[PDB]
Amino acid sequence: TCDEKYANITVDYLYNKETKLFTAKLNVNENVECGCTNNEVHNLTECKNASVSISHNSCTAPDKTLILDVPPGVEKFQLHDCTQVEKADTTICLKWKNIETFTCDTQNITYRFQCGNMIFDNKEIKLENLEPEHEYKCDSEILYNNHKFTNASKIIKTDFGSPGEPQIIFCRSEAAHQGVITWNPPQRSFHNFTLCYIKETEKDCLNLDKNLIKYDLQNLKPYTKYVLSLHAYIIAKVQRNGSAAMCHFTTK
Ligand SMILES: *[C@@H]1O[C@H](CO)[C@@H](O)[C@H](O)[C@H]1NC(C)=O
Ligand SMILES: *[C@@H]1O[C@H](CO)[C@@H](O)[C@H](O)[C@H]1NC(C)=O
Ligand SMILES: *[C@@H]1O[C@H](CO)[C@@H](O)[C@H](O)[C@H]1NC(C)=O
Ligand SMILES: *[C@@H]1O[C@H](CO)[C@@H](O)[C@H](O)[C@H]1NC(C)=O
Ligand SMILES: *[C@@H]1O[C@H](CO)[C@@H](O)[C@H](O)[C@H]1NC(C)=O
Numbered sequence: 001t002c003d004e005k006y007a008n009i010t011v012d013y014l015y016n017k018e019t020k021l022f023t024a025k026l027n028v029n030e031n032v033e034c035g036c037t038n039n040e041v042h043n044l045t046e047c048k049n050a051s052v053s054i055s056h057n058s059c060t061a062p063d064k065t066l067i068l069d070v071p072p073g074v075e076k077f078q079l080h081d082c083t084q085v086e087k088a089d090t091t092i093c094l095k096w097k098n099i100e101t102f103t104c105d106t107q108n109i110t111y112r113f114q115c116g117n118m119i120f121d122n123k124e125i126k127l128e129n130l131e132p133e134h135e136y137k138c139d140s141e142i143l144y145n146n147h148k149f150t151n152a153s154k155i156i157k158t159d160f161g162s163p164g165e166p167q168i169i170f171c172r173s174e175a176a177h178q179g180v181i182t183w184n185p186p187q188r189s190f191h192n193f194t195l196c197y198i199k200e201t202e203k204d205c206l207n208l209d210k211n212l213i214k215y216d217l218q219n220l221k222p223y224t225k226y227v228l229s230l231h232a233y234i235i236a237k238v239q240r241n242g243s244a245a246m247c248h249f250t251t252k
Contacts, residue, residue, distance in 0.1 A: 002055045006032075006064035009054065013149045015074040022046065022149075024068050032056050046073040047104040071144035072102035072109070079140055079152045082124065085237040088159035089132040095124035096142065110143040132161025163188035164232045164242025171247040176222040179249050182214045186232045186242055194241070196229035205229075225250045 010027040024041040026032060032039055033055050044050050047070060054064040082093035096111050113120040115127060115138045130136075134157070141151035164186030171181040181195070193208035195215060208215060210232075220226065228247035234240045 001062055002059040003062045003064045005056070005059040006054050006066070009064065009066060011066075011068060011147075013071055013144075013147055015149060017074065019043070020046070020073060020075065022070055024050075024052075024070075026054070026066075030056055030058065041068065044068060044070045046070055046076075047102050069145060071147065071149035072104045073100070074150040076100045076102050077142060077150060079154050081154065081156060083156070088237045089161040089240065090128065090130050090158065092127040092130060092136065092138070092156050092158070093124070094138055094140070094154060094156075096140070104144065108145050110146070112141050112143065114139045130158045132158045134158050160189060160234055160236040160240065162240045162242050163190035163234050165245045166193070166230055166232060166242075168228075168230065168245045168247050171228055171249045173220075173249050173251045176252045177218060177220045179217045179220060179226055179228075179251065180214065181217070181228050181230065181247055183230060183245070184213065185210070188234075188242070190232040190234045190242065193230060193232050196244075198227040198229065199224060220251055222251050 006028070012025040012027065014023040014025060016023065021042070022044040024044055026036065026039040026041070028039055034041065034052050036052065041052055050068040050070060052066045052068060054066055076099055078097045078099050080095050080097045082095045083091055084093065094113065110121065111123045113125050115136060136156055138154045138156065140154070141148050143149070166186045167184040169182045169184060171179060173179045190210060192210055195206040195208055197204055197217060199221065226249055229244045230247065231244040232242045
């Protein structure tokens with residue numbers, strides 16, 4: 001009987017973004033008859049059970065009554081980049097968002113991701129310790145009753161990382177109220193330098209142009225131990241500071 005021959009028949013769901021309708025592809029070799037041109041049932045509404053009566057000349061009545069459990073709307077899911085701005089240079093957070101309600105039960109909805117060669121099974125995923133200034137291709141798919149109905153790829157860039165630290169050539173007093181700091185610039189990309197002079201509980205900071213490699217410090221307490229801090233910062237999706245290069249000298 002056709003009900004016997006096709007009792008365990010399987011289906012693949014193909015979404016049309018223009019029509020907002022699904023096509024059910026019947027996983028059979030022979031050209032089957034319904035009541036389904038090229039073994040495809042077209043124009044199926046999302047999250048609605050539809051019935052198809054299947055037969056073929058190679059089998060007798062009763063027909064196989066096949067229930068199509070149609071998945072949710074492909075446009076109702078959005079692959080969102082949830083990366084926290086402060087950690088954008090070393091992390092990736094990807095999450096599928098449910099942008100519109102659907103009637104399908106969510107317990108039958110499964111999300112899968114593939115980043116490098118790592119495979120994840122969850123609505124959201126998080127990658128850490130990534131090297132800054134690189135691009136990664138994360139592939140993802142959504143299953144309904146273990147049936148893939150949608151997929152997407154997300155190419156993500158790991159934002160400008162923290163620069164430096166700079167290499168201090170020297171820092172010495174050259175007058176009773178003066179001290180000089182000279183350095184070499186740090187290796188990564190940055191916007192400016194931040195110089196600090198520390199006299200015990202006291203601390204005053206500055207802002208130096210990326211192009212300078214020397215600084216003069218006037219109006220200082222004579223015969224006093226000073227500590228200079230120097231780091232370079234970059235204004236990325238957040239201000240990222242490089243590690244500080246310490247310096248010590250004592251006035252004349
Ligand atoms: C139904 O599907 C056919 C193609 O199989 C298409 O030509 C037709 O416009 C669709 N009708 C509706 C109402 O979506
Ligand atoms: C379709 O039918 C099955 C039983 O065959 C039922 O459990 C399921 O809830 C129905 N699908 C939807 C979308 O409600
Ligand atoms: C969905 O998956 C298939 C098979 O892996 C792939 O060929 C297709 O390109 C994917 N869809 C998109 C939009 O990339
Ligand atoms: C660098 O420092 C100067 C002086 O403090 C300032 O005018 C400039 O806007 C700073 N650069 C950036 C990118 O903030
Ligand atoms: C970076 O350094 C500045 C001084 O240059 C400091 O005021 C600020 O707290 C630091 N920024 C961040 C985001 O840690």
